[PDB]
């Protein structure tokens, strides 16, 4: 028994060992109380803008629609406090914690971004923080893993399984299983057991908000589409969740297609997976025939998790949204094109967003359109990557 | 087939708790997992709880982990586990088996297909670990529409009202996890009249056997403590097997009272 529809459609639900089900309970009584509170919404607000940045600029691109009929603006939570929008919904979490009375946060990480905003909301808020990482991304990210020391957070390597993101869920479920009456779980993406879908979205809709007071301001319409990359699904929500009634308005979600769909290479599970159960939650996931859960690929390391937030699949469902996937080379050139004709460095989460947007606009040059993308992230994390291949290249 | 019925009757004549060990199909391999339960059954194993290896066992500490593991490892799919589970009912035919399952199996190729398959193999009961009582209607309803006994777990953070679920919606056995006292979670459910209730929670010792059904439940079984002794005594199988014998025949020893 719940306050909230832990179910959009089909998808969705609290698929958690009995034990937990207290846990999230709780959560979504608290979670409910804080969005009637007009203290709790403006120490939150608070937060956003005097210590993380907000709002975010909405800048036009220049250079990059030279020669079209396309009209390109970007949001740029590249320049939130961490370099990523991740920031917006840990401070939402950590402040939630706080009112619950908890005073430890778990969180789990793979490419690392998710860990680095949680151990600074843990610092910034005076929590004790313990993250959980697979030991495959410990190796790989040993930046973040220095970053989240110095911040004070506890990092815990996990072995387990494949030992990667999918892992690290587990492993910070099981803890919480047992140390939940004194910490909150800080999962990192809108998707799990209800009510983290509806949670992490509320904790990010002000990305679309600002969206849509500042392109109303700029150009006095609304778009025509907005286009963000999903990897759970928490950025692309949270610019899409204010335009959903704005039925004139395209949502445009892109999934990695890695190495190519035909491939199986890729992390598309909305669109190339099977619905099943995992992870809390009935949705599209990257599966095997038997029905064992397979790693996603994407050359960026954001985009790893191996299903879909419930109501992005909702929303696909019923043809509100639409989603497209981009290959590993299509989000390289978008990459280096943002850099080049724009001296912005994005980060290759958001460069497969933009690669579709370019896409739209050169396919169909003479199309009159007003295309907003979520860059949900600057780049200066993946210049190594980005080297590397350049230089395998030539 | 009522089994597990059947083992409660004889087991209260003779003044007996059960014993039932959890063992992973097909850990280390096939056919040594075949060896384990015969030798688990052979030395006085009431019942059987059997998991199926699954990519993401969030429910499960790290022994369990490393069994899936293991009989991955081996090569062990959904499907040889089928093959396996029949075999073990045509050499046993009494014995009631429990799966321990998670829900992506179950859902993966239709959930009343699961369960249909179920009773074609001869089990008698099936645990959805990441299925709580809230969502569980689909997988109960098929379930008894197949003659499955669906087992839920009561934790020890159970209200009343989990305990009202539970007792209504359960059937073969309640699977016990250990703030609430032990035995008025025993008496609760009782009360309720749930079905007979096994203590699942660190059940290690003969000692611990003695105390779960002098404190009224029907048994025990032991999650993890068969399991460990399979990782001890991986490169001998036969100090596996005598290792085994013993433990469990001390700890149904010890079942009675
Ligand atoms: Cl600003
Ligand atoms: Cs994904």
Known sequence: ?394 | MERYENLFAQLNDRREGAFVPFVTLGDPGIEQSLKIIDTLIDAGADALELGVPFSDPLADGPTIQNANLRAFAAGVTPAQCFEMLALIREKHPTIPIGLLMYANLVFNNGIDAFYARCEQVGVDSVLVADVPVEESAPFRQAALRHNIAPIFICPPNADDDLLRQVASYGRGYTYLLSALPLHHLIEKLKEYHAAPALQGFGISSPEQVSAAVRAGAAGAISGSAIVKIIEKNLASPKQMLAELRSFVSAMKAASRA
């Open chain 1, 1 to 394: 028994t719940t306050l909230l529809n832990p179910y959009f459609g089909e998808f969705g639900g609290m698929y958690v060992p009995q034990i937990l089900m207290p846990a999230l309970n709780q959560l979504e009584e608290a979670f409910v109380s804080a969005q009637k509170d007009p203290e709790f919404q403006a120490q939150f607000a608070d937060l956003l803008k005097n210590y993380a940045g907000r709002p975010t600029a909405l800048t036009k691109c220049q250079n990059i629609t030279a020669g079209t009929r396309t009209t390109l603006y970007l949001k740029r939570e590249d320049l939130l406090h961490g370099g990523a929008h991740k920031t917006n919904q840990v401070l939402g979490q950590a402040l939630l914690a706080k009112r619950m009375g908890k005073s430890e946060i778990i969180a789990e990480t793979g490419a690392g971004q998710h860990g680095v905003a949680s151990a600074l909301a843990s610092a910034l808020l005076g929590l004790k923080c313990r993250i959980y990482m697979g030991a495959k991304d410990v190796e790989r990210q040993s930046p973040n893993v220095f970053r989240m020391r110095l911040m004070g957070a506890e990092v815990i390597p996990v072995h387990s399984g494949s030992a990667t993101l999918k892992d690290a869920c587990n492993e910070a479920l099981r803890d919480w299983s047992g140390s939940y009456e004194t910490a909150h779980y800080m999962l990192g993406t809108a998707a799990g057991p209800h009510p983290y879908p509806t949670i992490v979205r509320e904790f990010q809709r002000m990305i679309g908000e600002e969206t849509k007071a500042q392109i109303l301001d700029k150009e006095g319409r609304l778009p025509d589409a907005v286009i963000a990359c999903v990897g759970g699904g928490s950025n692309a929500i949270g610019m899409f969740a204010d335009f959903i009634n704005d039925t004139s308005v395209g949502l445009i979600g892109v999934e990695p297609g890695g190495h190519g769909i035909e491939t199986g290479e890729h992390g598309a599970p909305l669109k190339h997976g099977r619905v099943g159960i995992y992870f809390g939650m009935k949705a599209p996931m990257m599966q095997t025939a038997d029905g064992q859960i397979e790693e996603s690929y994407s050359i960026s390391a954001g985009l790893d998790f191996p299903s879909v937030g419930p109501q992005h699949a909702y929303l696909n469902s019923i043809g509100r949204a639409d989603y497209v996937s981009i290959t590993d080379d299509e989000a390289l050139e978008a990459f280096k094109t943002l850099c080049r004709h724009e001296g912005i460095i994005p980060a290759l989460e958001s460069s497969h967003a933009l690669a579709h947007a370019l896409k739209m606009m050169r396919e169909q040059p003479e199309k009159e359109q007003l295309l907003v993308v979520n860059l949900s992230g600057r780049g200066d994390k993946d210049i190594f990557t980005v080297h590397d291949i350049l230089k395998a290249r030539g």
